[PDB]
């Protein structure tokens, strides 16, 4: 009796191992993250978050990839030296254990994730996608 | 069976033109 749970919470590929995909969250107000592994990891991995604006050439395509600044919560102990938001998947995550994440500060119209440099060979064995909560339109 | 249903995420609504009566020169 599974409902048509695609007419809400629509998922879109964000990182298929070797290629990112800007996704539009404008219609939505809430969007999370789902990380999955496909093989065994070697060392921890890092990823940088980017966001895109409506290109002046076309109001329906993503612009460039602007880095996302990290917003600190209360009770924070460390801030990225650049102040830009980023995520990291720790070592020893077996590829039958999904991982969730969410930045509390949206900006732009498209979101994207990229494997932070030097930690991109293992990125091939990583899959990332995103679901949403909203429609608004 | 699975009737995969759709909706739009975005679109590119253009600007419809607006032509209005041109002046009449004259019949003849």
């Amino acid at each position: 009796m599974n409902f048509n749970v695609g007419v809400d919470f629509p998922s879109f590929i964000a990182w298929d191992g070797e290629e990112s995909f800007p996704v539009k969250v404008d219609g939505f107000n809430q969007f999370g993250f789902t990380f999955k592994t496909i093989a065994a990891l070697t060392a921890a991995t890092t990823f940088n978050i980017f966001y895109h604006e409506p290109s002046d050439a076309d109001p329906c395509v993503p612009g460039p990839a602007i880095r996302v600044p990290e917003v600190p919560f209360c009770d924070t102990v460390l801030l990225s030296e650049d102040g830009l938001a980023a995520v990291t998947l720790p070592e020893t995550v077996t590829p039958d254990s999904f991982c969730a994440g969410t930045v509390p500060c949206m900006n732009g119209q498209w979101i994207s994730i990229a494997p932070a440099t030097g930690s991109e060979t293992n990125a091939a064995n990583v899959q990332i996608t995103v679901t949403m909560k909203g429609a608004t339109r | 069976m699975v009737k995969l249903n759709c909706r739009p995420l975005c679109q590119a609504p253009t600007a419809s033109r607006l032509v209005s009566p041109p002046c009449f020169i004259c019949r003849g």
Binding site: - | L18, S20, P21, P22, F24, I25
Partner: protein
């Protein structure tokens, strides 16, 4: 998790081009009637010095007849994204069915293509059609519509017939009230930033799904927007005798016992009515 009580729809209705036609009722599904074709010549001024008389040619006669038509929908279910509770989707389907019935009935009576339909008086092509006059401009006879024409159309109706109203789209009336003369003045009613005369006095009933020759105001014209050749511009008739709508049975709805296996509740509905044209002479159509 704070669901509200607003149900914004944004769906449009047509005009009701039914109260103009001759409304008639009958129980049976097949009706018939009489017609007087043309009385005809029955003599001449007999000359003098002749106690004799003469013959000639009388007029034909035709007892005509017509039928009704049906419009029925089944719509089953399964009952558990259903009866449990979000909303009475049944009532949604009922209202959508009634709206569909009205809109398709109006569209048919306007454009009904012969077989199993009331023959649409538009496609009948037996109403007289008056194409408009081409318009030379910068060495190009580009088709276009011009104020006097409309008046010439509305006044060219044979007065002795009777009161013949007119029908047109709001786009056409907007194009018309925006007529500008050579003096840049608003050619028609002028000097109030608009033009709102009561169309009831001006014997015009408006609609919005008529063929709209001024498609979303985009089709106007100087060289590319051109109003486009032969395109229904408007019409005019004494609809109390031009067309007729016969009504037999309204929409009905009932549960279909059998087939319903306590989950797939199968509802059945439908309706029966029809229409036809009188003599398609009391009325004409303005086209490009």
């Amino acid at each position: 998790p704070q669901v509200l009580a607003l149900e914004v729809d944004c769906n449009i209705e047509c005009a009701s081009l039914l109260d103009l036609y001759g409304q008639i009722e009958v129980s049976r599904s097949t009706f018939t009637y009489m017609k007087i074709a043309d009385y005809g010549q029955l003599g001449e001024y007999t000359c003098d010095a002749k106690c004799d008389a003469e013959f000639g040619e009388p007029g034909n006669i035709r007892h005509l007849e017509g039928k009704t038509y049906d419009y029925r929908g089944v719509f089953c279910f399964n009952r558990k994204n259903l009866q449990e509770a979000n909303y009475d989707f049944l009532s949604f389907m009922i209202g959508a069915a009634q709206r569909s019935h009205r809109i398709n009935r109006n569209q048919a009576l306007m454009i009904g293509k012969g077989v199993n339909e009331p023959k649409g008086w538009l496609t009948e092509n037996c109403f007289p059609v008056f194409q408009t006059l081409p318009v030379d401009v910068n060495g190009t006879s580009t088709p276009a519509f011009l104020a006097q024409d409309w008046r010439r159309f509305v006044t060219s109706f044979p007065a002795e017939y009777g009161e013949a109203r007119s029908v047109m789209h709001q786009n056409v009336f907007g194009y018309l009230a925006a007529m500008v003369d050579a003096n840049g003045r608003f050619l028609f009613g002028d000097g109030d930033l608009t033009f709102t005369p009561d169309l009831v006095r001006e014997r015009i009933r408006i609609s919005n799904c008529l063929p709209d020759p001024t498609e979303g105001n985009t089709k106007g014209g100087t060289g590319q927007d051109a109003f486009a050749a032969g395109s229904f511009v408007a019409a005019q008739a004494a609809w109390k005798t031009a067309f007729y709508a016969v009504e037999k049975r309204p929409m009905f709805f009932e549960q279909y016992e059998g087939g319903s296996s306590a989950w797939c509740v199968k509802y059945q509905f439908g309706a029966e009515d029809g229409g036809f044209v009188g003599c398609c002479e009391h009325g004409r159509i303005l086209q490009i």
